[PDB]
Amino acid sequence: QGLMQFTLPVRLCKEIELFHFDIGPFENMWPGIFVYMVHRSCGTSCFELEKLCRFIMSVKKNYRRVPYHNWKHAVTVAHCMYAILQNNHTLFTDLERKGLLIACLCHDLDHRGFSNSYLQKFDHPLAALYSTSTMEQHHFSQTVSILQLEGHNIFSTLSSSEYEQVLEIIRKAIIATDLALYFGNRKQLEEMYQTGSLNLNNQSHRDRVIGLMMTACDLCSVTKLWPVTKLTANDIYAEFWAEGDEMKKLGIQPIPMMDRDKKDEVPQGQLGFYNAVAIPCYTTLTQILPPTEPLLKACRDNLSQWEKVIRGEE
Numbered sequence: 017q018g019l020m021q022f023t024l025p026v027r028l029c030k031e032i033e034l035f036h037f038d039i040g041p042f043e044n045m046w047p048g049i050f051v052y053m054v055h056r057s058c059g060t061s062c063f064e065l066e067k068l069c070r071f072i073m074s075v076k077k078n079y080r081r082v083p084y085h086n087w088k089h090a091v092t093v094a095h096c097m098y099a100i101l102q103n104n105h106t107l108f109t110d111l112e113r114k115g116l117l118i119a120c121l122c123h124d125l126d127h128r129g130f131s132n133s134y135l136q137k138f139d140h141p142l143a144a145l146y147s148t149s150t151m152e153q154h155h156f157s158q159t160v161s162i163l164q165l166e167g168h169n170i171f172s173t174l175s176s177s178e179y180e181q182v183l184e185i186i187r188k189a190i191i192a193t194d195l196a197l198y199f200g201n202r203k204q205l206e207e208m209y210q211t212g213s214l215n216l217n218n219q220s221h222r223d224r225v226i227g228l229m230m231t232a233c234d235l236c237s238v239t240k241l242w243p244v245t246k247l248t249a250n251d252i253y254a255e256f257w258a259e260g261d262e263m264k265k266l267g268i269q270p271i272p273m274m275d276r277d278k279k280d281e282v283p284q285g286q287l288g289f290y291n292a293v294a295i296p297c298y299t300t301l302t303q304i305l306p307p308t309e310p311l312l313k314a315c316r317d318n319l320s321q322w323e324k325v326i327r328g329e330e
């Protein structure tokens with residue numbers, strides 16, 4: 017380094033600050049987009065450039081060539097966290113800023129394009145090692161594996177204490193991307209917000225709020241402009257339909273969301289998802305962190321586009 021400031025072309029320099037930024041189809045630019053975000057979010061001092069670059073490149077290598085849960089999803093989820101962090105400057109600790117972009121880049125490490133349910137029904141060894149949040153315990157394990165490679169300890173300057181804290185932020189942040197855990201977490205956050213007991217000084221409360229940020233970042237395809245949201249849905253369903261086919265091979269009728277013979281039902285399925293998951297998620301997140309409101313707004317725009325799909329207006 018250390019007078020070596022990463023810079024993006026003008027359109028990307030400006031649009032990367034917005035919630036609805038799409039990182040584009042140039043895979044070789046995604047590392048530099050991430051380093052740019054870390055440097056602006058955390059500092060040019062938070063990591064050794066050489067270590068960070070070696071970390072990024074091994075993380076990339078440990079994402080698979082699957083239609084949705086790939087390297088592009090990793091960096092997209094990290095970008096949504098960057099936009100939240102940058103819009104809420106003063107609310108987050110030095111360790112939080114360090115851990116959370118890394119947790120986002122690593123949150124689906126070594127994903128095979130299959131749900132926790134499918135692993136359990138297949139009887140995958142990972143389902144015997146990790147009885148709940150199966151893939152999420154695996155993603156965290158792969159994150160620690162990569163951090164333990166020679167020349168890959170991006171946290172090397174931290175004390176023993178701070179290193180355990182940062183790895184505990186990452187572990188909780190990654191486990192929270194289990195959507196099965198989201199529903200309870202958001203209910204509690206909503207009760208706490210409304211009875212005015214929510215306290216960002218209570219670590220157990222910060223944990224919940226970081227969990228909800230992680231869901232919000234993970235679901236951020238619903239917060240893009242319609243043509244991005246619509247095209248991303250295709251990749252999401254390409255994975256679901258493969259899992260459906262694999263369910264059928266075990267002699268199990270999949271749920272309709274995963275059945276490629278039931279493609280006509282996707283628009284109504286999207287409606288349910290925006291109503292039951294996405295809108296509540298961004299609504300509670302906006303109550304706790306008002307500057308995240310553009311995510312709710314974009315989500316509501318996309319619900320309205322799915323309503324139009326159903327009404328054959330598109």
Ligand SMILES: CCc1nc2ccccc2nc1N1CCN(S(=O)(=O)c2ccc(C)cc2)CC1
Pocket residue numbers: 131132133195196235236237238249252271273285286289
């Ligand atoms: C409507 C579908 C949907 N659309 C999305 C659109 C945009 C972004 C994210 C999206 N996520 C979606 N999924 C995420 C996965 N879950 S799950 O509950 O973990 C689940 C897992 C396995 C099985 C067998 C049943 C349920 C369901 C919802």
Ligand SMILES: [Mg+2]
Pocket residue numbers: 123124151193194
């Ligand atoms: Mg995941």
Ligand SMILES: [Zn+2]
Pocket residue numbers: 089093123124193234
């Ligand atoms: Zn994810």
